Every structure is written in C-alpha cells, then in structure tokens.
Amino acid sequence: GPVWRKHYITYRINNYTPDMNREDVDYAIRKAFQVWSNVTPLKFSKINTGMADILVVFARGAHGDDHAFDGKGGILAHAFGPGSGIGGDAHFDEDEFWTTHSGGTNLFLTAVHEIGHSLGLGHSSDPKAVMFPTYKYVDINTFRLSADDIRGIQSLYG
Numbered sequence: 001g002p003v004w005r006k007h008y009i010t011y012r013i014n015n016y017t018p019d020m021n022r023e024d025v026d027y028a029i030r031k032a033f034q035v036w037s038n039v040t041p042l043k044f045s046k047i048n049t050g051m052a053d054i055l056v057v058f059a060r061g062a063h064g065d066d067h068a069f070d071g072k073g074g075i076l077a078h079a080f081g082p083g084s085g086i087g088g089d090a091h092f093d094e095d096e097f098w099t100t101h102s103g104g105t106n107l108f109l110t111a112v113h114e115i116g117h118s119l120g121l122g123h124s125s126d127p128k129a130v131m132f133p134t135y136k137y138v139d140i141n142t143f144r145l146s147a148d149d150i151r152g153i154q155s156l157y158g
C-alpha cells in the first residue's frame with residue numbers, strides 16, 4: 001500500500017471537539033504523532049493554515065466522505081491512507097466523548113491507531129498491538145508500541 005515518500009509531514013487540526021480542553025486536544029494529537037516519529041525517520045509539524053498532509057477532523061454522522069459515523073459507540077474514528085487530498089486525513093466521531101483519561105474514549109490512544117492508518121499501516125491480529133482492529137484502553141502515561149507495531153511501521157519506513 002501507499003506510504004509517504006517524504007520525511008517532513010504536516011498536520012492541521014481542522015476543528016476541536018467541545019468534549020475536551022483545547023490545549024489537551026493539541027497535546028493528545030501531538031503525543032500520538034510522536035509515538036510514530038519515535039520509531040521512524042518521519043518528522044511531524046502542526047500548521048494552522050493552508051493544506052496539511054494530515055487533516056484532523058471532528059465530525060458526526062454523514063460528513064462528506066463515504067465513511068459515515070454511527071452515533072455514540074461502534075465506530076470511533078477512521079483515517080485514509082497516504083496520498084493526495086483526503087489521503088492521510090483522520091476523522092474522529094463527535095458522538096463519542098473524547099478524554100485525556102480512562103473515561104469516555106481516549107483521544108490519544110485512538111489517534112495513535114488512526115495515525116497508523118494515515119501512515120499506511122493495516123491491522124494486527126495481536127490483541128496487544130495498538131493496530132489491533134478493536135479499541136482497548138491502556139494507561140496512556142505508560143503507553144508503549146507493541147513489538148508487532150514497531151515491525152509493521154518499520155516495514156514501511158526506515
């Protein structure tokens with residue numbers, strides 16, 4: 001599948017969930033990109049204007065693509081693989097309740113998984129991997145990529 005053919009990648013947060021403090025949204029997404037730059041040659045930068053490689057969106061229901069959201073629960077988020085336009089973009093379901101913690105849905109952990117998709121990673125069958133296809137909460141202050149995640153991303157970059 002496609003991969004980014006460049007080392008400097010930009011992102012942009014299109015809008016903010018009302019579920020969280022703004023600076024906490026900024027930090028969760030930043031930390032989530034950091035998980036992947038930790039183990040690859042990629043560098044991620046947040047821009048506040050113009051076109052970014054990865055647009056970060058909060059939206060509910062039908063939101064202008066072919067991956068409608070489904071209300072609270074079920075699908076939490078989705079992301080497009082590397083490429084032009086909507087490629088790379090990561091959408092988060094506003095009908096979920098995003099948090100910094102174990103309540104509602106953890107935005108950081110979700111974003112790590114979704115940014116894996118934005119970078120061109122598929123799913124792992126290992127329940128310990130962040131790329132396992134089903135959301136499972138782990139403590140975020142001690143989060144670490146599984147060895148399966150690392151081999152997956154390192155198969156694509158670096």
Ligand SMILES: CC(C)C[C@@H](NS(=O)(=O)c1ccc(-c2ccccc2)cc1)C(=O)O
Nearest residue numbers: 075076077078109113130132133134135136
């Ligand atoms: C359009 C969707 C069907 C695909 C999407 N779905 S998801 O919201 O169910 C999702 C989100 C996060 C995870 C996840 C798994 C492990 C750790 C952290 C997040 C898994 C599934 C996904 O796999 O990213």
Ligand SMILES: [Ca+2]
Nearest residue numbers: 071073075093
């Ligand atoms: Ca949902």
Ligand SMILES: [Ca+2]
Nearest residue numbers: 053085086087
């Ligand atoms: Ca894009």
Ligand SMILES: [Ca+2]
Nearest residue numbers: 019094096097
């Ligand atoms: Ca919400």
Ligand SMILES: [Zn+2]
Nearest residue numbers: 063065067091
């Ligand atoms: Zn979408």
Ligand SMILES: [Zn+2]
Nearest residue numbers: 113117123133
């Ligand atoms: Zn997934």
